Write a protein that binds this ligand. Structure first.
Ligand SMILES: [Mg+2]
Ligand SMILES: [Mg+2]
Ligand SMILES: [Mg+2]
Lengths: 430, 431, 431
């Protein structure tokens, strides 16, 4: 692989090359990608989409924003070092350090844009509907990969669909730069085979069969290395996808901890105990001791721990840069961290006190009923579109059979929590 | 013969009632109106909304306004009929207000038997017996008995509500046969289904349980036969054309008025859609001086309804003999010089009101509510011994053949107020 | 049978006898039973468990307290008279009249501890679930008596399980005296055969198969008389169980009536008419006429009527004491009352005005849906414990197949109304 091609400014449908040296610096394709996501309806809808805890103040919008800020910093710091290592990228092709930050920031901003409501439970409810619920009746009319898309419905792949879906008058969706789409693709494989190895890039899949042809275009414009030895297609990650992943991992690990503490689920005394190693060399104890509010103290620790992990991730990336470029790096960047023990203790505490708290369990149980109900109504109307009731369902909630089912899943998944519950209540009469 | 069409007979009468022998302070046709006003089914329309639920758009007010428009149509046609057939007054004693009373009473009761949620409610009841739990009874019912259920009709349920016999109260409201005739827009049974494209064959007007009653009504009125087979059908009482025009006029103009007051229809469309109907009579300087939206559209509504009333009266008299002979194949409004404008109004209401998201949501919820109450009642009917089914009995139907039980369940579910249908549904589901 | 053995102080697991004369009277086994019930979690939970009416001021907790007070008087007066009849019980064995009050008071206090919410409809909802709902799939994997425990699930039998359930660290449950467990058992039989005779003691059953071995121990220690060795075990009632039953019958009859009057369902004018014979000989007419509030007048009549019925029950018990000791008394104490005519009229009106009131019917209909939903979720999670959904259900809501099913029924039954409604609403997605 080669950074000239990995940094492609191509947009869908382009007939001519886009030279980096010919970009208007006030209209740089990578920075335009950020703005197009910010102003898109799917991104705006994240305001009414909650994280694990429903407080009105912990939204999927804020997490996506904070992940993108951490990603911009990671891309900027790695970008400067890549241009020192590969100076022809600047001198000949015209690339600049902010370009790497723009790519990572845009891809990070949109990482959760396709996830269904209710978190991983939402994904499992959609899958269970097609594995064992009403939807399993379609198994014999779909390819193995088409059915695997449904029974293992993946929010990551739905995000790729959302970013690129074509509609009359809007071919290419948001038409993001191919480098940004490459940085977005954490799992560059189709739904089959399922988990062929223990590599992180193979734990899940990144595109539906409906988007296979699109990512094939992306994968070769970027010059990504083929990996699979079969008709089952798979590529090794765009190097910048490692930075998108590190930003999410850092923010999920540290900010969930901060949230659990501010919400009262995690006792405040655990903050210093679990983060002292991550913040020791940079913390100002007199500043810390002078802070009077709990929230101000843990946010201070949060900023210090994120700064530490950002710098360490940048160094880890450059240490393994050639292995990543060759598709031989077998781990995430955070897996190589010197703070793995502290990171694991933090994650396990968040699992026990937040993700397995009674309120979250209750929300996930209700999410199953809500999604299963919306999925059954749309699928029954698809099967019998002639009855008066199914026509009403058609107007309220809303090609080949597979295209209709994957579209139904994508639409149910991008519904706000408020719209999913409201439509659920009408289907039930409340 | 108009003399027979103006029958004052009430169900169970053993002797004739002559028009000339009536006390005019107690005229049978006017008593009919009063009996409807005080009836429990009519009062229940206070808690029944139309498709839009604003608390100030009830089926009660719609019914009132339809009866007012009907009285005017009947009065005006009545005066002209007594000019055409003077023996009706000089010999038989009929007066022009008699025709207004008959049309007014029948129009007042037009929506009395309709289920909640509009046409979706009728469709939900039908689907229950066609493809839901109720299909199990198909083989225990005649074709016409089953057709009553799978194509359950609010018009036919209204006839049942007006006439249903109960202990201590045989004959229901016991309205004059002229009023029941003016009420019957579809004087046929559920089968055969839509035998022609005649307006009177678009639906049916009585269930099998009321067939014998309407047979008595049609013979007394001297209605003309339309079938000579065991599938009975008759030509419409001429005054049923006026009941229908009152409904057509009010549904067209007042839905529009409501859509504008509710925000569903942009006010900027008001003049454009109504200009042909009000052009010659509108005082434009008065219209521009009115400061409230509700005042401007109620002025246009009054002008458009007055225009359509006057024209409908003239259409009725132009075709009176075809109507009296049962050869008129259309509605009065179908012959209107404003058919194109009426159609544009109705289509705009369909797009902006009936297909609005709030109306769609309510109809979807209605399907669940009604389907649930029907299944609860029908399972309780099939196994009345279980504790649960005894409670369902005490709750939904306190105090017969299989068909009579099923049609009664449909009639009772249909006449539930909005509040009681949703509340009972909530309990059977625990909300 | 013998009163020396019937008054056993044995607790589950004991290795040595407990002599009454050797008890510390500040720690008397029978009085300790009362305290153990008061402080137990199942008894505390009755604060959030409502009766038929839902006024927040009519709890199953208050009823249990008042029954235990009336039960203590019954036991005290019968105990004093029994020690007169059989003086050796005090002279040689050391028993005192308050011992009989304590036994009856503790058993009466715990009579409703195992009942599901929603009254007898609640028990019927659980049974219907296993008879015709999802639970019917287990029929062929259960013995006839195991399945009968489920389809005729009995709150009395669940109470016995609650008081005796052994769990790690707590063998014997609340570890109540065997005399108290004997007085608690109004139906000393298994679920099958169903109603072998018309005797009150055969109308229901008193222990599940899971607790059979245990009542066998209790019945053996108490010397209860065997009533069947047909492999279907049954015993004659502990004599004090008649007093526990009389306390519940007096309180339910008189206090349901008073509550209905205070709530408006029964017109106050019925109070004196139905109760004059029960209070006439002891009522102070001057006091009654001076009382100004309705609630004050009916509570005065209630105290008088309850006092009359307690004295009569004490006399009925002593008259039939030997027949009861011999297991040949075939009726309840209240069945022999001279006021049976007045008791019946009181009960019938309460049924008509309270138990068949629309509010109560509605609550019971919803209870069917709430209990069926909670039972189905638990049972699907039992059958497929591997799915992600069923593991979530397990973290939220929570041996042989039968032991798992009877435990699921016991846990759903002992839920407070608040957690049952909340968990049900979560399972259904409602707030
Ligand atoms: Mg994330
Ligand atoms: Mg109408
Ligand atoms: Mg009781």
């Amino acid at each position: 692989a080669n950074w000239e091609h990995l940094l492609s400014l191509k947009r869908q449908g382009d007939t001519a090359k886009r030279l980096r040296i010919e970009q208007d610096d006030t209209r740089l394709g990578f920075e335009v990608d950020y703005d197009r996501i910010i102003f898109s309806a799917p991104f705006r809808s994240l305001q009414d989409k909650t994280q694990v805890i429903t407080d009105f103040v912990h939204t999927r919008l804020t997490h996506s924003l904070e992940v993108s800020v951490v990603g911009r910093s990671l891309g900027r710091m790695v970008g400067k070092k890549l241009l020192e290592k590969y100076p022809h990228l600047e001198q000949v092709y015209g690339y600049k350090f902010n370009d790497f930050g723009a790519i990572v920031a845009a891809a990070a901003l949109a990482h959760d844009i396709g996830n269904p409501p209710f978190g991983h439970s939402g994904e499992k409810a959609i899958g269970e509907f097609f594995k064992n619920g009403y939807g399993k009746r379609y198994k014999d009319s779909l390819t193995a990969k088409e059915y695997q898309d449904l029974i293992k419905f993946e929010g990551n792949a739905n995000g790729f669909k959302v970013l690129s879906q074509s509609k009359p008058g809007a071919q290419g969706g948001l038409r993001l730069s191919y480098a940004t789409l490459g940085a977005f693709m954490k799992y560059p494989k189709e739904s089959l085979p399922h988990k062929p190895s223990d590599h992180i890039a193979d734990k899940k899949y990144g595109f539906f069969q409906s988007e296979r042809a699109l990512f094939e275009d992306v994968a070769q414009e970027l010059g990504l290395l083929k990996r699979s030895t079969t008709d089952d297609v798979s590529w090794s990650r765009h190097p910048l996808a490692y930075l998108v992943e590190a930003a999410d991992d850092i923010c999920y690990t540290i900010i969930d901890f901060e949230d659990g503490i501010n919400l009262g689920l995690i006792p405040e005394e655990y903050a210093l105990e679990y983060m002292v190693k991550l913040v020791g060399q940079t913390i100002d104890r007199n500043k810390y001791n002078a802070l009077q509010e709990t929230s101000d103290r843990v946010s201070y620790l949060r900023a210090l721990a994120i700064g530490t992990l950002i710098n360490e991730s940048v160094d880890t990336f450059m240490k393994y840069e050639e292995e990543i470029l060759a598709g031989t790096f077998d781990q995430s960047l955070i897996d190589k961290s010197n703070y793995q023990a502290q990171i694991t203790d933090i994650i396990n505490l968040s699992i026990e006190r937040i993700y397995n708290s009674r309120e979250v369990i209750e929300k996930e149980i209700a999410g199953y009923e809500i999604l299963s109900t919306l999925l059954e109504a749309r699928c029954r109307a698809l099967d019998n579109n002639d009855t008066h009731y199914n026509q009403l369902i058609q107007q309220l909630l809303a090609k080949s059979l597979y295209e209709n089912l994957i579209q139904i899943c994508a639409e149910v998944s991008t519904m706000t929590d408020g719209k999913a519950l409201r439509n659920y209540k009408k289907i039930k009469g409340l």
